[PDB]
């Protein structure tokens, strides 16, 4: 099981998750793949932004469901 989280630059990264690896877990899947902290990610699905108080199951996310992402630079 995995998904495809496309960035603000139109490029995607394959990531393994479960219906229990909620957004705070997913932020570690994207951090592991590039080094981007949970404090600078911004994850979206079906065109809305998920929350660290939900689950991937709360938003019916499944394998290959395709997601979207944005990032920041903290300020510098």
């Amino acid at each position: 099981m995995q998904i495809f989280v496309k960035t603000l630059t139109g490029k995607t990264i394959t990531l393994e998750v479960e219906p229990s690896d909620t957004i705070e877990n997913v932020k570690a899947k994207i951090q592991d793949k590039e080094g981007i902290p949970p404090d600078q990610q911004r994850l979206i699905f079906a065109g809305k932004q998920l929350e660290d108080g939900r689950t991937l199951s709360d938003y019916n996310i499944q394998k290959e469901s395709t997601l979207h992402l944005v990032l920041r630079l903290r300020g510098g």
Binding site: L8, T9, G10, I44, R72
Partner: protein
């Protein structure tokens, strides 16, 4: 909106993919991104 307030490395044809609560996050002005 065109690149009228977007980052110096982004395009509306790849920023209209974001919710209205992120329209205000990229129209803010950023860096470390180049649509590539």
């Amino acid at each position: 909106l065109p690149l009228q307030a977007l980052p110096e490395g982004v395009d509306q044809e790849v920023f209209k993919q974001l919710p209205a609560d992120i329209q205000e996050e990229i129209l803010s002005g950023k860096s470390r991104e180049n649509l590539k």
